[PDB]
Amino acid sequence: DEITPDLWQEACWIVISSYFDEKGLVRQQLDSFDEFIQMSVQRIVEDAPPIDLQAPPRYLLKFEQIYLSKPTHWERDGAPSPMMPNEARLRNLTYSAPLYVDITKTVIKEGEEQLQTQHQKTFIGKIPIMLRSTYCLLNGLTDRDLCELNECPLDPGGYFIINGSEKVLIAQEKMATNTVYVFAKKDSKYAYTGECRSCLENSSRPTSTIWVSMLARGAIGQRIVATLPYIKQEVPIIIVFRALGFVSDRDILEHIIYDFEDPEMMEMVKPSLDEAFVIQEQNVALNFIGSRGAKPGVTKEKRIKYAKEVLQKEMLPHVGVSDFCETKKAYFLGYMVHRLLLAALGRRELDDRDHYGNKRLDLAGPLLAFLFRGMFKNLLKEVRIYAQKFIDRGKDFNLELAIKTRIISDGLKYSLATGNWGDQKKAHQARAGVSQVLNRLTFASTLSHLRRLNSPIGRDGKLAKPRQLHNTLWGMVCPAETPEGHAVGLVKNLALMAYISVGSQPSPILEFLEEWSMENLEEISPAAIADATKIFVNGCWVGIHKDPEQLMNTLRKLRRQMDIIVSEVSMIRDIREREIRIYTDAGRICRPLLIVEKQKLLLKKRHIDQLKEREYNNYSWQDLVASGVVEYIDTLEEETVMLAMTPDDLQEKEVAYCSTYTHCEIHPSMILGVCASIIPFPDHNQSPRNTYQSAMGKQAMGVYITNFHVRMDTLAHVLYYPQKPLVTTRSMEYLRFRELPAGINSIVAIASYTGYNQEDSVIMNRSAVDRGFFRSVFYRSYKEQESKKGFDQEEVFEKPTRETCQGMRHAIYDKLDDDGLIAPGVRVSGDDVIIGKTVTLPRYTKRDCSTFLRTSETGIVDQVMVTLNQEGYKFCKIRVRSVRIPQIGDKFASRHGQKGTCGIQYRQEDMPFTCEGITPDIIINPHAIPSRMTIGHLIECLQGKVSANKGEIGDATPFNDAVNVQKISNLLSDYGYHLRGNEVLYNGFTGRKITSQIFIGPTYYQRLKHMVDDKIHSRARGPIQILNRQPMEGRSRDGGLRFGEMERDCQIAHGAAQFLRERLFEASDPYQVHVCNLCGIMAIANTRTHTYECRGCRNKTQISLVRMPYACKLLFQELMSMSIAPRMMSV
Amino acid sequence: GFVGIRFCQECNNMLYPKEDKENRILLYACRNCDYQQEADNSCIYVNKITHEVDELTQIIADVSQDPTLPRTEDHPCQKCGHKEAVFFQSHSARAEDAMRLYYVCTAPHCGHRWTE
Amino acid sequence: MIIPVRCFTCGKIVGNKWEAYLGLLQAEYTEGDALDALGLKRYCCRRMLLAHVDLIEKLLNYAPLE
Amino acid sequence: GRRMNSKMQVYSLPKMMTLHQQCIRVLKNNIDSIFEVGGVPYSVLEPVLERCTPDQLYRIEEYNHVLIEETDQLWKVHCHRDFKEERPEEYESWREMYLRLQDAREQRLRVLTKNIQFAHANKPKGRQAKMAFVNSVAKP
DNA sequence: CAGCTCCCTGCTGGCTCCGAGTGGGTTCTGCCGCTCT
RNA sequence: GAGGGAACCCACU
DNA sequence: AGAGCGGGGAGCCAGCAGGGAGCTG
Ligand SMILES: [Zn+2]
Ligand SMILES: [Zn+2]
Ligand SMILES: [Zn+2]
Ligand SMILES: [Zn+2]
């Protein structure tokens, strides 16, 4: 039974609820880490070459089955214990599991057999385990089991704990591998170039890129050359084909030009043939390539070996890295030249760099695999160095001494802790920001950070193309959620139902293709290629097929029933160019779409009925995937589908747009991400306001996680009374926003009242604020440890007495206990002491290194936690709690980018009131609406008034025909209110009716983290910097403000030269030097004895006092260090 | 129009034009070996500048099965007379000057393509 | 976290009405009728009971440190 | 608050359609809705059967049995459309060999699915990390 | 008058710049093994 | 009554 | 012997290699 249109909204939200019941929101991180742990680590260990060390007896070291434990902690006693995540968070431990490998060492002796020794389960390092993955201790636990462990069942996981810090791996957008991309190089010697970032699948090795370029016109014609890897000059492509073992010309041109009746391809290969005519033999071509390699050879034989290994293992590794694969590599190189000729003729079109069919997403899996590949190569290097150092002189080596277990452990820990991704010794060339501290400010921050993508493009680039909202981001990437400022359009977020493919083996597809009438490339004449469809599997041309209807239909039928083709395998057919491309690699981003066949959905009422009882049929999303109803479509495959926005598009129209829809959208509001799905009516807002709300819903204040009392976070914000919104979208159920909400439903009058809400400000109700409206707590945690710095410097938690301790900040230690720490319940102030630490120096033996509270931060010690860190030292964390009452200057925002600061607070008797005595909680300016065009704000106020009168929770899903302004207006008029939300407000000061009628209603406001008391700063004088003797940096260091260069220019244009001197000389760094009146160099000046002396002149009577900035003295002394003499001549 | 390449038969390679003044004729003489071959056509190099009027050889008939390509019923086939056709444009750089519709017959095994 | 003692806008006592509201909801009153039975006639109090998220039930699932 | 929303495939049925042309083109837009034609011969049903799919021909031939001997030529129309690389042997009508080829192909598909499923997971062994659970004191 | 000299031009390589001002955070220095008792 | 730098990341106008 | 010391874009400028003219024996 077809789903009738009156049931379709319920049906699509039921199937969406099934998707978010099974998959969840952080599924891509957990899937990538699980596939890294299960498959990638073992592949890296096995694919590493065995260590063959001979001085002599020969030792063969082979690595075998890996073993991974659960995350365990070893204390200083050495006793293992199961490490829970809260213990790792509190004690600053790295939540890692030990990795045990099996090693086999075989001994070979002269005239003697092997000796095989089995070091079973050898410890080689600790892998940091991602939270709530398969190998975490929280896996498989229920909500009660998680609450017994003081964990949050709503906490998504998907992050690591490194030194007690939650780290998220941001996905990185790499270019897709094994795919020929042809671009016209801008202002270069090549008119068109064709590249292939070639990399052999399921093997972590760096990609080897080959370019096949075609030169610019301004010789006879157009020359195709080849920029090979490790060949530093441009080899002509015909010479490469000769070096591959093809002397003839029908061989090369049958590999390149598949149809011989076509003349233009021949007329363009003619200059490339005729420029490389003088080379006619294979080894002559090998010599011609190897003569221009990175390592040339004096011997011709060495050059032949060099060119052979370059063309064997480096030039196109994905098609073949082994011998006898010259025909498949040569067909792929001919395909690259063919695509270059097609694009240069204009017959084919140039590739787009911003198309996410051309881009893969390195998640935690591939990134950690790249790390572990490098670090296991380092470990094997260390083992071979140790064992070679022994077997050079010594009899034998014990292997457990050769295994440097710090390599894997500290390398993974360093890269996950600092975010500099790679090796520490090359940190300047390492990409940063791959690992980030997980944002825990609200739950929306956590989910948005866990679903974040990054373009590895410099943020100073003035080109806009990677920053643009490309058309192919539909349904994969949120169109609204992006940062403002230098990272706009580069840092992105996934949409709600977007899933990133985890990776699959190409093999079963290859056997199926072999037994389904595909003719291999190695067993065909090229003359059959010209009318047959080429088949690519993971970018590898594997054969041709002559019936592409039945092959594509068979492949789609297999994928739709969870057979040989798994669900994430992408199968694109390019009809116009006769190609079938099958991609199984990781990093492809896809989304589920309903399947439409013969203008009818395959999703029928029986599926909805079975999903309605998901708890008691065991029916789920995966059964929909198995039923051939939904289908995962990625970006390249979305270029060949015909989408229906709604099933109403499938209905026959009076002007029929399309009758060949292939798929249909489940709901279009799944193009939005996590933070843009909180916006009510996003389609009624201007898109900059949607982006602004996507930014500011991460800075809102709510309850960031349920177990916030256990956690010692450095900064935490908890709202007193978070409310779920009265006007929600249906996507907000799967973000768990009505369980960890981040705002309050205010009564907002959009009115001009007293002028204090002008230019984005708001007027709050003082009486409402007194009742807990937007009241919150700020938790700040301080950590301190008794670090043992050698034998002398012994820092200890002792309550400091002035009789024995020096170096104090002269503050009272009376609130400290006798264990050196403060205790919970004590009020503290900005000068007070919370940790008393004393270091023993070699009367004042002890120096005071006490931990002081942050300046001007009133609070009460909420918790003190005392533990032992990984090093066995005493370690303490103190959480201080400060109640933040809403105040003038605190930043409040609605869900429509209507941010502002509280400009004034009026009491209840002062704020305007309706005839029922309802005063607004917030008053915003009318002028904040018109140029902003946030009509979603007005509709949210109207719908919230209707929902608060009716008792419902209003639905504001973006694209919903069942909800419109007229329907809400009629509903509001049904409750005795004006239909457009206006009310007759009375002046609170005079009692008189306001002549205009004020638009008032419940609107969901959120309180942002940007409070004024966390930003107010002032200075008279204080700390100066060490080097330049200018004031310090920031309010945390009691620093000064920068009177920068444009302020200097403005004061020049003012003509205020004395104010310019006061700012740039007196109020920054006044100084006096003594300058010789002859040479102009600064002179020695004993001001105690009035002994002024200038060496270099022997001058003692002509010395002058010169007032300068200290930075000018520092500059002039750096210049005299630079062998430059600034001779400051006073005449 | 365009004249194709000529290939040597002995060493499997390209031929090259040459003018033998003994007969004062044109021969395709390979220059890897001693193979020679007289030429049927005197045209050696030929170029097309505004002769891009024939976009139909670049069109393959398979595009009748594309679900994303637009179908019309107002342009019937000349060969088989089917009502359904697919219409598109030529998408080359050498066809930016034109927005001419090219039509391909939707019915199987026909494959007839036309313009206007 | 827990039901506010007073309505923010007006000051009507709503802290004694959360358990009554939940009992009326599990007695299959509609939310509008449950709010009307509790005497919450202004929509400023109806949003106070309607939009409340009672997080304290889930904070009581954690075993007490003190 | 209604949203205006519609699309149009631009361009550039103006046709004198008489009785037989109208009847055949109505059938050419609703082929699949035929249960049983009654006693109609093949010659008048020539065009719409040409623009038809073999599942629909199967349904018609199992509802309109007596027509099969005059449909066989049209099956060659399907055969050279789908099994073009084949010729029938002696005493072979195109309908039954077409259905034999279809059944053989779908059985080959089922056998391939069964073989590749057992010969890739249940037959071989893929190397994977397993739980250690040693609680080794290799790292103290 | 052929070869040499002597100044215009074309090319490639080198070099230097890339908004102002604020909060907050973590992580690193430092990196480990020795020769002497 | 005043004892670190640097790198990086996030955010703000 | 542990404690401690040692080991990307954009745009402008400058030098060198090609011309084309003139010159002298
Ligand atoms: Zn002097
Ligand atoms: Zn020859
Ligand atoms: Zn036709
Ligand atoms: Zn109230």
TrEMBL record, chain A:
Mind listing the UniProt keywords for this protein, alphabetically? DNA-directed RNA polymerase, Hydrolase, Magnesium, Metal-binding, Methylation, Nucleotidyltransferase, Nucleus, Phosphoprotein, Transcription, Transferase, Zinc, Zinc-finger
The record's principal subcellular location, in a coarse class, is nucleus
Name a single GO cellular component: chromosome, telomeric region
State which Enzyme Commission number(s) the record gives: 2.7.7.6
Please report the stretch or stretches of sequence annotated as the RNA polymerase beta subunit protrusion domain: 24-409
Catalysed reaction(s) here are: a 3'-end ribonucleotidyl-ribonucleotide-RNA + H2O = a 3'-end ribonucleotide-RNA + a ribonucleoside 5'-phosphate + H(+); RNA(n) + a ribonucleoside 5'-triphosphate = RNA(n+1) + diphosphate
The residues that hold Zn(2+) 3 are N1077, L1078
Report the GO molecular function annotations: chromatin binding; DNA binding; DNA-directed RNA polymerase activity; hydrolase activity; ribonucleoside binding; RNA-directed RNA polymerase activity; zinc ion binding
Q: Specify which residues bind Zn(2+) 2 according to the UniProt entry for this protein.
A: C1076, C1079, C1094, R1095, C1097
UniProt: Zn(2+) 1 binding residues: C1076, C1079
Q: Which GO terms describe its biological process?
A: transcription by RNA polymerase II
- Asked whether the UniProt record includes Zinc-finger among its keywords, one would answer yes
Tell me one Pfam family matched here.
RNA_pol_Rpb2_1
* Residue ranges of every copy of the DNA-directed RNA polymerase subunit 2 hybrid-binding domain listed in the record: 675-1037
Location(s) in or outside the cell: Nucleus
Give the Gene3D superfamilies listed for this entry.
2.40.50.150, 3.90.1070.20, 3.90.1100.10, DNA-directed RNA polymerase, subunit 2, domain 6, RNA polymerase alpha subunit dimerisation domain, RNA polymerase Rpb2, domain 2
Q: Where are the transmembrane segments?
A: none
Domain RNA polymerase Rpb2, by residue range, is 176-362, 436-500, 535-597, 621-668, 1039-1129
Cofactor(s) needed by this chain? Mg(2+)
Q: Family, per the entry?
A: Belongs to the RNA polymerase beta chain family.
Q: What does this protein do?
A: RNA-dependent RNA polymerase that catalyzes the extension of a non-coding RNA (ncRNA) at the 3'-end using the four ribonucleoside triphosphates as substrates. An internal ncRNA sequence near the 3'-end serves as a template in a single-round Pol II-mediated RNA polymerization reaction. May decrease the stability of ncRNAs that repress Pol II-mediated gene transcription. DNA-dependent RNA polymerase catalyzes the transcription of DNA into RNA using the four ribonucleoside triphosphates as substrates.
Q: What is this protein called?
A: DNA-directed RNA polymerase subunit beta
From TrEMBL, chain C:
A molecular function GO annotation = DNA-directed RNA polymerase activity
Keyword Cytoplasm attributed: no
The yes or no answer to whether the keyword Transcription is present is: yes
What Gene3D superfamilies has UniProt attached to this entry?
Homeodomain-like (1.10.10.60)
The UniProt entry's GO biological process terms, in alphabetical order, are:
DNA-templated transcription
GO cellular component term of the entry, any: RNA polymerase II, core complex
Residues engaged in binding Zn(2+): C7, C10, C44, C45
Q: Where in the cell is it found?
A: Nucleus
Name the InterPro entries for this protein.
RNA_pol_su_RPB10, RNA_pol_suN_Zn-BS, RPABC5/Rpb10
Q: Which domain of life is it from?
A: Eukaryota
Query: Which keywords are on file for this protein?
Result: DNA-directed RNA polymerase, Metal-binding, Transcription, Zinc
Q: Which family does it belong to?
A: Belongs to the archaeal Rpo10/eukaryotic RPB10 RNA polymerase subunit family.
Q: What does this protein do?
A: DNA-dependent RNA polymerase catalyzes the transcription of DNA into RNA using the four ribonucleoside triphosphates as substrates. Common component of RNA polymerases I, II and III which synthesize ribosomal RNA precursors, mRNA precursors and many functional non-coding RNAs, and a small RNAs, such as 5S rRNA and tRNAs, respectively.
Q: What is this protein called?
A: DNA-directed RNA polymerases I, II, and III subunit RPABC5
